[PDB]
Design a protein around this ligand. Sequence first.
Ligand SMILES: CCCCCCCCS[C@@H]1O[C@H](CO)[C@@H](O)[C@H](O)[C@H]1O
Ligand SMILES: CCCCCCCCS[C@@H]1O[C@H](CO)[C@@H](O)[C@H](O)[C@H]1O
Length: 283
Amino acid sequence: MFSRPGLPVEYLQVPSASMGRDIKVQFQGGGPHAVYLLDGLRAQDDYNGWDINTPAFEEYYQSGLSVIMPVGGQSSFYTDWYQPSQSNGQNYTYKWETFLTREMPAWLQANKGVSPTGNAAVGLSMSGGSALILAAYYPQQFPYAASLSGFLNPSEGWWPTLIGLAMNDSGGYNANSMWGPSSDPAWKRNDPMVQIPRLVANNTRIWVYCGNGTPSDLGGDNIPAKFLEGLTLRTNQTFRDTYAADGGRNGVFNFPPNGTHSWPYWNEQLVAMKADIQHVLNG
Ligand SMILES: CCCCCCCCS[C@@H]1O[C@H](CO)[C@@H](O)[C@H](O)[C@H]1O
Ligand SMILES: CCCCCCCCS[C@@H]1O[C@H](CO)[C@@H](O)[C@H](O)[C@H]1O
């Protein structure tokens, strides 16, 4: 969308006792509360997708909010896996939920003064659901969560199968090593749709977005991007319906007649939610 720098962006090495390795984290200070920008399915080990494809850091510079971009975790869904991925030779078990909710916040608090509470989890595609799940089980840390083109009903119908195929295509990861067979309780535990009651109880402020598959001049005009957005939109519409039916009253639902499963649109939403996050996290 556009690079950015001249800005105070740091590259940190945060030890993960649970994963037995150091996790690289891109960071821009600016306030005690932060926006956790989670990556997509094809998360790389060099830079977080938001920095690679958008002016995210530049857009939140001097916003009164710090920006945290963890790096890595391809096809991890930012969850704690049952075991190492039985397929691509992963020699350790992904424990990203533990990292994001315990190890990383403790590190940032001790060394930089970033508050472990009152933050926002923002995810897209793969991590859209993850952000909502984090808010569902860790309300103190995440009173705010945004899901951009997320897959909000992972345990339903063919989603477990499709997620498995996508994970295999992205680094050869195995969904079975993550949450087990589709019949395993882990699938429902991490299903935003199923956890709506928790988001209601917590009074989580949620920002849910999803395009309809029709590209605009912003780009992302390709079959995969168009089909994926159109498909998951159905899940997002049902999430919205269920949220309301369950008593939900603190959400923003953006379902415009455009947008594909691509970065330009996720960046547009990141900008649009800035004021919303500022007012919710900084009163
Ligand atoms: C059942 C859910 C299947 C999801 C499959 C999504 C395939 C890629 S999507 C999306 O493509 C971008 C490049 O276009 C990447 O940068 C993002 O990381 C990635 O998330
Ligand atoms: C060409 C026909 C393509 C049909 C694609 C269906 C994809 C199913 S998604 C599924 O759709 C339901 C519709 O009711 C929602 O309730 C669910 O939450 C959502 O996950």
